[PDB]
Amino acid sequence: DPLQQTGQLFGGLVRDIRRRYPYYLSDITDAFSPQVLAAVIFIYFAALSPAITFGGLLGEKTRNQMGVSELLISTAVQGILFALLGAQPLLVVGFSGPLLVFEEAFFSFCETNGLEYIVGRVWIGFWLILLVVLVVAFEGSFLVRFISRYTQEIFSFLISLIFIYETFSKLIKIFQDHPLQKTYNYNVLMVPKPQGPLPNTALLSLVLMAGTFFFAMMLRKFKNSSYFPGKLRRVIGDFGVPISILIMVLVDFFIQDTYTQKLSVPDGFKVSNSSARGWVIHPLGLRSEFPIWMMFASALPALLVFILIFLESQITTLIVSKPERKMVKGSGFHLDLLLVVGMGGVAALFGMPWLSATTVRSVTHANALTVMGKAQIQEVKEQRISGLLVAVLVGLSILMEPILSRIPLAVLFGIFLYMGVTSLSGIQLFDRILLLFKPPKYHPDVPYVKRVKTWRMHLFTGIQIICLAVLWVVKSTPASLALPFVLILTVPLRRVLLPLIFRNVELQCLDADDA
């Protein structure tokens, strides 16, 4: 198994290298298939748009200390390294809401205490570099084995709901910014962006979203359909999202008059605010002499940042490398936790954000490479060039501004909704949530339906909604960085309370390692 206690110091790192690197030729040569090129295109727009979204949200909140340029270079650099060195290349490394909430929370603290933020992270980085090596030394990444399906399901579901919620709030914002009014003022500037509201902007956006999501779902239906020859049907199905986007991007191109929000990158490869910082950030104070207490008190935030990246990256790896998916290569949790956290702490030195292995984009990347037949899984295309070319494109995103400038965010929102529903494909919790509305006569022929009672099977599914409810309440409240500690409290339940209120035969059936 991958999470066995070796005992020998850095045995978990070495066995993960001894596991995957013998298959390094297959990790390059399995990327010649056309389904992989279709994944690169799909996952590029999946990887880029958050780097633009979170990039803008950071700058706005951190006064350009770290913005779109630093996140794009981080996401590009760490992505290329992790693509070439990672134990699971299908893990797409990038910046997340969890991290966004920390950066702004550390800034808000740094301004109050009179500390140079871009410097304060370089210390947090050194502790993340220290803590990860100390964990990887004692094979602490083994603890992944104790992360059960139950928690992986709650993690798989909660983030899928958030990614869907964020997508709609992104469309709702266009109706708030450009409401359906009887009259509109045309004496408004459009150089920075529309100052006041405009006609035809918000409904065309809705149409551009609804159109792309439609063309996405129909092409997913078409992929595993009976129409057209098998060779042409799979190619069209594999290039589903690329065709979905291309159509609805051309739709808006031929609408000359109507404005709608496009993709926005910086002018070139420059620091967001030259007055604030440089490329390389000095630990002992860039301007004002940095205090000695924060140089050692940065461990407390780093312990928090570690957990956020750990429980994000590792649970993502469990979900992406499940037995039910045909994962021939395997997975290395020790090397993945080392790289993701290690690169992040080093990235802080250059005033660029530390990243994690985000589930949706990682899941989406695997799902886009996962083949289907007859339906069941036959062979999941496992290689590095997919995860590499995504990071390379996110690096070149600033240089290829003329191509991105004609792509509406409305079109991208259609694909994020598709990614949201596509992520819920192989989640037994969602599949059990479906049985809540189905009558008991029509339930699927699965062990947890046959061997367990229906009224008890729904109570388990119900207790996971009690978790999701509490998990969603913590997300909204000020104490949002306490979510990892509430998510890791999920294990104690499945280990004590659930067994205490259930029969062992039911758990094994309900919560199984494989199907």
Ligand X SMILES: *[C@@H]1O[C@H](CO)[C@@H](O[C@@H]2O[C@H](CO)[C@@H](O)[C@H](O)[C@H]2NC(C)=O)[C@H](O)[C@H]1NC(C)=O
Residue 421 binding partner per list ligand CLR, a second copy, ligand NFL, none, with a CB distance cut-off of 5 to 8 Å that depends on partner kind:
none
In angstroms, what is the minimal distance from the CB of 305 to ligand NFL? 10
Residue 437 binding partner per list a second copy, ligand X, ligand NFL, none, with a CB distance cut-off of 5 to 8 Å that depends on partner kind:
a second copy
Q: What share of the chain is helix, strand, coil (3-state, %, to 5)?
A: 65, 5, 30
Cite the beta strand spans of 23-130 per DSSP E. Answer: 93-94
With CB under 8 A as the contact rule, the residue among 192, 267, 437, 445 that binds a second copy is 437
Q: Using CB under 6 A as the criterion, what x/- string covers residues 137-176 for binding ligand NFL?
A: ----------------------x--x--------------
In angstroms, what is the minimal distance from the CB of 326 to ligand CLR? 23
- Cβ atoms of 486 and 470 within 8 Å: the answer is yes
- Cβ atoms of 380 and 327 within 8 Å: the answer is yes
State yes or no: residue 13 binds ligand CLR (CB under 6 A): yes
Q: Using CB under 6 A as the criterion, what x/- string covers residues 188-207 for binding ligand PC1?
A: ------------------xx
Q: Which residues contact 146 (CB under 8 A, 6 or more apart)?
A: 491
State yes or no: residue 480 binds ligand X (CB under 6 A): no
For ligand NFL, give the closer residue by CB, 151 or 272.
Answer: 151
CA–CA gap between residue 40 and residue 392 (Å, rounded): 10
Residues 169-188 that bind ligand PC1 (CB under 6 A): 171-172, 175, 179-180
Chain position carrying tokens 């929102």: 413
The stretch near ligand CLR (CB under 6 A) out of 141-149, 206-214, 241-249, 311-319 is: 241-249
- Cβ atoms of 364 and 423 within 8 Å: the answer is yes
Number of shown-chain residues binding ligand PC1 (CB under 6 A):
19
How many Cβ atoms from other residues are within 10 Å of residue 17's Cβ? 16
- Cβ atoms of 48 and 394 within 8 Å: the answer is yes
State yes or no: residue 97 binds ligand NFL (CB under 6 A): yes
Residues 453-492 that bind ligand CLR (CB under 6 A): 455, 458-459, 462, 465-466, 469
State yes or no: residue 254 binds ligand PC1 (CB under 6 A): yes
Maximum Cα–Cα distance across the chain = 73
Quick one: which of 72, 32, 161 has its CA closest to 394?
A: 72
With CB under 8 A as the contact rule, the residue among 56, 140, 199, 291 that binds a second copy is 199
State yes or no: residue 322 binds ligand NFL (CB under 6 A): no
State yes or no: residue 101 binds ligand NFL (CB under 6 A): yes
For a second copy, give the closer residue by CB, 201 or 490.
Answer: 201
State yes or no: residue 419 binds ligand PC1 (CB under 6 A): no
State yes or no: residue 186 binds a second copy (CB under 8 A): yes
CA–CA gap between residue 354 and residue 182 (Å, rounded): 47
Q: Which long-range contacts (CB under 8 A, 24 or more apart) does 40-44 make?
A: 40/386, 40/389, 40/390, 40/393, 41/239, 41/241, 41/242, 42/240, 42/241, 42/242, 42/364, 42/368, 42/415, 43/92, 43/361, 43/364, 43/365, 43/368, 43/386, 43/390, 44/389, 44/390, 44/393, 44/394
389 φ, ψ (degrees, to nearest 5): -60, -30
With CB under 6 A as the contact rule, the residue among 83, 241, 352, 417 that binds ligand PC1 is 417
- Cβ atoms of 135 and 12 within 8 Å: the answer is no
In angstroms, what is the minimal distance from the CB of 286 to ligand X? 9
For ligand X, give the closer residue by CB, 63 or 325.
Answer: 63
Query: CA-CA-CA-CA torsion for 47, 53, 54, 58, nearest 10 degrees?
Result: 150
State yes or no: residue 275 binds ligand X (CB under 6 A): yes
Site residues, ligand X (CB under 6 A): 63-64, 273, 275-276
Site residues, ligand NFL (CB under 6 A): 97-98, 101, 159, 162, 308, 311-312, 475, 480-481, 483-484, 487
